[PDB]
RNA sequence: GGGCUUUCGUUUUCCUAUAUAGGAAAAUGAACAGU
């Protein structure tokens, strides 16, 4: 099953780059349907403190998985743009309970593919080493933050590892805070790894780290948020020799609604590669514009007056679930999750 | 090069294979053979007979990444490619030959040999107390999270590890009755032992130590002089000399610690960055400034220092002296007063064997490593230097690994009624010794401030392991 | 490079039945993946 996902992602990337560390998100309409790559990203770098922007014109994590999630968010915004009464049947969204929000249809699902393991708790194992998590040591399961000048992470202006962010996705959904105003949380059906695949430490890292001490965490999670446990798999055949070849710090991102226009960023700073220093299309400003256009189209003038921070905090359910998940992580002995100062998100669109 | 399986035929119990060697665009005689291995051997053989002289076949594709760059270093590399010390060398090589007199023929390849010799008094002939070989290191993939691998296999490093094992055994043998016969004596206050003033240690390396001790052609070989004076003569011809340097993984040469701010991390190295192990010359400098006993042993002993270094090839006084001990004294003696007794710099007598053995082949350097300690008797440990484990299908634990050293430390702490140390982890136990940690941190800070770079340390998840 | 851990396929031997096919022990030659 994962071989088709990997080959689809590789073929899509090769076709788009005809004119590596590569992640993609793939939406499969039905089981018989092969599936289509919907979001694509590459990169291995993260910005430093000097590239941090208060107004949010720089992406603070050019890693492959994060940028693929950003592309998927843009794609979801596009699909919400395309939704109407006439095209309701042919779309992937259906009315949810209460009629206040839309929701993803049951048949359509999403899957994730990463060429290598996420940084953090996903590659803490040696050659010696239903979900089957592994908790043989006290140090296992701790949060780790990305280090500058490298792909690695160190245990706890600091950006959590890819594994911790995948856990946050598996608990609070993929759509983020803003799309909660118009959607129910969406969870990955499967996670596929190309290299550095351990069953015990990947399932512990992404889903099961909050189920070590029993089911005392799920009961306190208000609906519809759930502790998703996506199916975890690996590609059948793999290149033997680990690849140590030097890797450029350019990051390529693409979404299904962009046709054949890739965007290139440099992870050291987080802007489009060019002398003019163009604003990235996966930046906070573009996402806020896209949401404010969705809100204008949906006649929800209430959310227009709210800034990025106010609109993000407007989703009471999502923010409560986020705070509860953070507190549950801090309780079990994993260290405090770091959040950037609110002045970064306190920007008003011009 | 390519070995093409032209054809396979015959029944499974007696197949016939037909192989052909190809180099670039030149094809060679096709051969019949009984096994694939012998197919390749005979194909190669035929190609060689055709072109031992043409050499067309020889040029294509080396596998690991390359870069000897210090400054215009390519010409330098091409030029490079093209007590009475003799007693130390004879003792070391006789001990090696006696140990491996009738073992497997796999130890007939080229090797680098290092040994540590102890002399109990003036008329002592000399006895080998350690032995190590090898020329390789581990990869970034083969690291371990519980200390089951050796991060290096250079001859001097394995020799020092064997010396550590010998020190542990000799501390085991010590007691109140046999204090006189033991090499140790009580220090001021009796808290920690110390080495007897009549006992000395010497180190012999079959070649020059990698790093700052080998940036000169073999044609720069100074002649052996029995100079009575012990005063060194370092030479600082260029700023580039004195820089620290690491043996990078899958790379050739010995490259300085650059403006490469890549922070060594466990998952980062696993994901595919380059693993940099420090050169042997830097390690020998660290021994001369801190001691050969490491950090754990300093609980029960004062630092143990060396007295002489004997090299069997590529000796240059002005280079080696700066490589091992003089590079920390270039800018005055202000570094010496910063260090705290019993930690002090050591200036061992440098020496060269009377005549080098001219047969020093450059290619065909295998990866096998050999270890031997005094307590072991006739038992030698053979390791595969690429993986850092015992060479064999079972890849069992190496007796010089961090885990076995920790086990010996626990045994000695139990024997010496040191209950407080018995409940600490490896990293905390090393950090328990305040004096050694302070001296090491000060020495690294002095190296960085004075202008030779920054020391490269393994990921914290690898030094502080789980037991 | 080495090295432990399903086959294909030889003889001998044992058995079934009618020299024959089948089953079985042994080793014999290549591939093979965990270390
Ligand atoms: O860009 P992402 O990595 O996908 O996540 C960012 C951001 O994380 P980074 O700053 O590391 O990029 C926020 O985490 P913080 O570091 O700011 O704490 C996080 O959550 P918050 O915005 O609530 O802090 C999230 O937001 P969401 O919960 O909607 O997934 C999202 O923020 P943006 O998409 O607005 O940049
Ligand atoms: O090569 P070795 O002679 O075995 O030195 C190793 C190790 O070096 P490796 O990098 O090759 O593993 C450590 O060096 P770093 O990792 O820090 O670069 C260092 O450990 P410390 O710096 O923490 O002291 C040292 O320690 P010591 O001076 O006590 O001998 C010792 O470590 P082990 O004895 O545990 O092997
Ligand atoms: Zn990452
Ligand atoms: Zn799980
Ligand atoms: Zn060396
Ligand atoms: Zn000196």
Short mmCIF file of C-alpha atoms (C1' of nucleotides) in Angstrom, two decimals, chain C:
data_model
loop_
_atom_site.label_atom_id
_atom_site.label_comp_id
_atom_site.label_asym_id
_atom_site.label_seq_id
_atom_site.Cartn_x
_atom_site.Cartn_y
_atom_site.Cartn_z
"C1'" G C 1 36.14 -9.15 2.20
"C1'" G C 2 34.83 -12.80 5.94
"C1'" G C 3 31.22 -15.29 8.81
"C1'" C C 4 26.11 -17.89 11.88
"C1'" U C 5 20.59 -18.30 10.30
"C1'" U C 6 14.02 -21.28 2.36
"C1'" U C 7 14.97 -23.48 -1.52
"C1'" C C 8 16.63 -25.69 -6.56
"C1'" G C 9 19.53 -29.96 -7.42
"C1'" U C 10 23.82 -35.66 -6.97
"C1'" U C 11 25.07 -40.12 -5.12
"C1'" U C 12 24.87 -43.69 -1.53
"C1'" U C 13 21.66 -45.80 2.01
"C1'" C C 14 16.48 -47.10 4.16
"C1'" C C 15 11.31 -47.91 3.09
"C1'" U C 16 6.63 -48.31 -0.28
"C1'" A C 17 4.87 -50.42 -4.42
"C1'" U C 18 5.75 -52.03 -9.26
"C1'" A C 19 14.32 -52.55 -13.19
"C1'" U C 20 10.84 -47.95 -12.28
"C1'" A C 21 8.27 -43.62 -9.67
"C1'" G C 22 7.44 -41.68 -4.70
"C1'" G C 23 8.86 -40.53 0.65
"C1'" A C 24 13.03 -40.16 4.16
"C1'" A C 25 19.00 -39.21 6.69
"C1'" A C 26 23.80 -37.24 5.16
"C1'" A C 27 26.89 -33.95 2.71
"C1'" U C 28 27.90 -31.80 -1.79
"C1'" G C 29 27.25 -26.47 -5.65
"C1'" A C 30 24.49 -20.83 -6.56
"C1'" A C 31 20.81 -17.08 -4.69
"C1'" C C 32 18.98 -15.22 -0.42
"C1'" A C 33 17.56 -11.49 4.16
"C1'" G C 34 18.18 -10.53 10.24
"C1'" U C 35 23.21 -9.71 12.74
#
